[PDB]
From a paper:
The polysaccharides in red algae (Rhodophyta) are primarily mixed galactan agars such as agarose and carrageenan. Carrageenans are high molecular weight polymers having a linear backbone of repeating D-galactopyranose units (G) linked together by alternating α-1,3 and β-1,4 linkages. Furthermore, transcriptomics revealed upregulation of the CarPUL during growth on ι-carrageenan, while biochemical analysis of eight CarPUL-encoded enzymes revealed carrageenan-specific activity, thus associating the CarPUL with the ability of these pseudoalteromonads to liberate energy from carrageenan. Detailed analysis of the enzyme activities encoded by the CarPUL, combined with interpretation of growth phenotypes, have allowed us to propose a refined and detailed model of κ- and ι-carrageenan processing by some Pseudoalteromonas species.
We were unable to crystallize GH167 from PS47 so to investigate the molecular determinants for activity on β/κ-NC4 we utilized a homolog from Bacteroides ovatus CL02T12C04 (BovGH167), which originates from the same putative carrageenan PUL as the BovGH16 carrageenase, possesses 36% amino acid sequence identity with GH167, including a conserved putative active site, and has the same enzymatic activity as GH167. The structure of BovGH167 revealed four domains, three of which are often seen within the GH42 family. The conserved domains are domain A, the catalytic (α/β)8-barrel domain; domain B, a 5-stranded parallel β-sheet surrounded by α-helices; and domain C, an anti-parallel β-sandwich. The unique domain is an all α-helical region at the N-terminus. Structural alignment of BovGH167 with BbgII from Bifidobacterium bifidum S17 (PDB ID 4UCF39) revealed that E295 and E472 [E288 and E473 in GH167 (numbering for the predicted matured protein)] overlap with the acid/base and the nucleophile, respectively, with additional conserved residues in the −1 subsite. Generation of glutamine substitution mutants at the putative nucleophile in GH167 and BovGH167 resulted in inactive proteins, confirming the key importance of these residues to catalysis and the location of the conserved −1 subsite. Furthermore, and consistent with the membership of GH167 in clan GH-A, it points to a retaining catalytic mechanism that is shared with family 42 GHs. Further supporting this, GH167 was inactive on κ-NC4 but after treatment of κ-NC4 with S1_19B, which removes the 4-sulfate from the internal G4S residue converting the tetrasaccharide to β/κ-NC4, GH167 again produced products consistent with the formation of κ-NC2 and β-NC2. The activity of GH167 thus appears to have the same activity as the P. hydrolytica “GH42-like” enzyme whereby through hydrolysis of the β-1,4-linkage, the enzymes release β-NC2 from the non-reducing end of β-carrageen and/or hybrid carrageenans.
Residue numbers in the entry: 45 to 520, 526 to 775
């Protein structure tokens, strides 16, 4: 397969030179050719280092039993993937050269010239979308086609003394570092300097395991972070390598439920901050004593446990602890951002937030996705998707869906509800592999569908996990059967960016489209309930396959964002802040529509019967009993404001449920752009009609080929169609 692969590579290389002569933009095929050239060397390394790959595959649970076989077959698997990729590239380009496929213009992005503008990354006055790879060697061979993301890494360990002196190695790097390509600054928090630990060992208490291994409420922690930022950021300020911002922490969390993963008790400094937060929350100690059933003489005497028990969920002390943990974490990230802004007043910050700390049920992490998203100039995350785990009972998505769609659809939709006008930067993309998922045979169709779908929901740039391959093909649980062994996956991410760039105005219209239904979200219900996000997902899923972007409402969204929706839905939200209800009342008072079930808005965050109830007044207050009723009323509210899509879609499949998420935008008077992704785990047939009038024609935007009003999508398939009406 070595000789055969080299043959196809040489064939594509000559076809590229010929197409170029005709003025064809061969970026896509050059990207594939470069991928092939790189992975031929990786396959040669694999062929010469079988023993190293046996070890690599043994560390992977589903490839452990057959490790010797897998290490033997890997080199020819990689060459066979290159042969498939060259056959696809040669077929496509020969069709393009013969006028049989229409190739849209697409930019050759110079990353030294990309700028952030509102919710876009701009090259030569147009929106673009960026992909690079974690730990990829920054060499010419790898930055020509596979991304040119720059940046700078630092750690509080680079503060070498109490005086605030910075490691000379770090000063030397920053003095020499060129302006460079668009990049981000990575703040490390796992490595706190030993001199500080020796000076006051309490500085290690109440960590946010494992990525913040010191006390965010300790004064020596604040001195050290202030000293790091003061001594480094003046060298970075305004530089192109800071353009995608300052990443304030890797996967932060301060889990505080005893016997749970990455949990620890909070420090004594943190508990003193808790007494201050309780004084602000409750006003007088008598109000705390009534709720906690305690007899403290004042706020300084509060002296409850420094870690919570799962059995306490629903109690006032538990609520207070989790609410405080969120607020002090938000304040910590505010402190880091305000220190950076002193030395770089243009700094954009973000946080590598795990979206499942909002999309799953747990609220003990101190991660307030709304507050951290609002507080960030760039929407940071490391959203995961991927397929079935290598072990365990099926996840709930496996009944209906090809992959875990919940973070890149529902969490993205929450983040964009909070902040619609920001770039979104996935700083460790987990849409190809995780610790739990791996498949050597992962399809280019899966890879394209995922990056495409995530981009429809707001994703602007991705540093994908991960390019652990060194230039020689050696390695710097995660490695075997990751992208480091998959030539067609590495190539398809960049091919997807090329297509998204080619239609980036359409893509920004899909990202920005009116979200006319907002699901009400409150921390009052998520903190007190074991399974609030099961309920929020159930109503999201119920609404999300009707052609409409589905978004979220909170108190903060209603107070800070234009009310560009037709209705709020309130589902299984029995706990609410009084201020939630008051804010939803003000929306009814502006003639808003609220659709509420029988179970919602019954108590405050302490389970006390609520003094206040929603009154219809000038708006529309609709009480419903079922999910079906709630959906029927929601879509009626959109129809009443003429907000339904201009193209109607029906889906049939062998399941009980839709999987095709679809969207429609206007291209002009009688032409529409239809976006469809099959998130379902089996083939779906979509059937399209005009809402008014009659479909004249359907074509593929990317190919110019004629399509039909009835289409089969395989799982992970993407359709982008131009629909003309008569």
């Amino acid at each position: 397969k070595e000789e055969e692969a080299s043959g196809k590579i040489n064939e594509l290389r000559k076809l590229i030179a010929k197409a170029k002569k005709s003025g064809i933009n061969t970026l896509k095929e050059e990207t594939a050719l470069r991928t092939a050239e790189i992975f031929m060397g990786y396959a040669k390394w694999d062929e010469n280092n079988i023993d190293a790959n046996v070890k690599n595959f043994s560390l992977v649970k589903k490839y452990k039993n057959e490790s010797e076989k897998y290490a033997k077959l890997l080199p020819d698997f990689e060459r066979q993937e290159i042969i498939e990729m060259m056959n696809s590239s040669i077929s496509e380009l020969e069709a393009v050269m013969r006028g049989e496929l229409k190739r849209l213009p697409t930019p050759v992005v110079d990353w030294t010239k990309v700028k952030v503008d509102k919710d876009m990354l701009v090259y030569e006055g147009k929106p673009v979308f960026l992909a690079d790879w974690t730990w990829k060697p920054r060499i010419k061979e790898y930055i020509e086609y596979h991304g040119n993301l720059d940046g700078f890494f630092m750690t509080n360990a680079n503060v070498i003394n109490n005086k605030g002196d910075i490691s000379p190695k770090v000063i030397n790097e920053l003095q020499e570092k060129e302006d460079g390509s668009i990049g981000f600054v990575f703040l490390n928090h796992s490595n706190f300097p030993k001199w500080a630990e020796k000076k006051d060992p309490t500085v290690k208490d109440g960590p946010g395991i494992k990525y913040t291994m010191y006390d965010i409420n300790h004064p020596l922690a604040r001195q050290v972070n202030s000293d790091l930022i003061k001594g480094t950021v003046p060298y970075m300020a305004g530089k192109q390598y800071t353009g995608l911002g300052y990443m304030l922490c890797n996967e932060p969390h301060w889990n505080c439920i005893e016997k749970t993963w990455a949990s620890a008790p909070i420090s004594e400094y943190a508990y003193e901050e808790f007494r201050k937060w309780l004084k602000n929350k409750h006003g007088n100690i008598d109000r705390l004593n009534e709720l906690w059933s305690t007899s403290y003489k004042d706020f300084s005497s509060v002296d409850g446990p420094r870690i919570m028990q799962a059995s306490m969920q629903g109690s006032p002390m538990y609520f207070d602890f989790m609410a405080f943990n969120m607020d002090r974490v938000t304040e910590w990230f505010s402190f880091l951002k305000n220190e950076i802004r002193k030395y770089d007043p243009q700094a954009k910050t973000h946080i590598k937030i795990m979206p499942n700390l909002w999309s799953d049920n747990k609220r003990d992490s101190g991660i307030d996705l709304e507050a951290l998203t609002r507080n960030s100039e760039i929407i940071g995350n490391d959203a995961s998707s991927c397929g079935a785990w290598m072990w365990g009972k099926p996840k709930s998505w496996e009944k209906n869906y090809a992959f875990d769609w919940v973070e890149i659809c529902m969490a993205y939709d929450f983040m964009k509800s909070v902040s619609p006008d920001k770039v979104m930067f996935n700083t460790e993309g987990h849409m190809l592999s995780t610790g739990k998922y791996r498949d050597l045979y992962q399809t280019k169709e899966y890879a394209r569908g995922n990056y495409w779908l995530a981009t429809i929901h707001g994703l602007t740039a991705t540093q994908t996990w991960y390019w652990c391959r060194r230039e020689d093909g050696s390695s710097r649980n995660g490695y075997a059967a990751s992208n480091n062994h998959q030539p067609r996956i590495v190539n398809e991410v960049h091919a997807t960016m090329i297509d998204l760039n080619s239609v980036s105005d359409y893509i920004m219209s899909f990202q920005r489209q009116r979200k006319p239904l907002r699901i009400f979200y409150t921390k009052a219900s998520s903190i007190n309930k074991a399974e609030h996000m099961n309920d929020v997902l159930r109503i999201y899923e119920k609404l999300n396959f009707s052609g409409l972007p589905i978004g979220f409402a909170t108190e903060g969204i209603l107070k800070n964002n234009p009310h560009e929706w037709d209705a709020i839905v309130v589902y299984k939200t029995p706990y609410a802040f009084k201020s939630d209800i008051e804010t939803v009342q003000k929306y009814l008072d502006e003639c808003g529509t609220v659709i509420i079930d029988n179970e919602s808005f019954k108590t405050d965050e302490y389970g006390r019967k609520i003094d206040l109830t929603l009154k219809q007044g000038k708006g529309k207050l609709i009480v419903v009993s079922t999910l079906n009723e709630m959906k029927n009323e929601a879509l009626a509210a959109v129809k009443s404001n003429k907000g339904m899509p201009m193209i109607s879609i029906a889906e049939t499949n062998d399941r009980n449920m839709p999987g095709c998420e679809w969207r429609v935008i206007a291209k002009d008077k009688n032409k529409y752009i239809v976006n469809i992704v099959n998130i379902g785990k089996s083939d779906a047939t979509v059937s399209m009609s005009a809402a008014k009038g009659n479909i004249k024609s359907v074509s593929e935007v990317l190919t110019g080929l004629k399509s039909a009003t009835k289409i089969v999508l395989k799982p992970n398939d993407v359709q982008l169609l131009e629909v003309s009406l008569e």
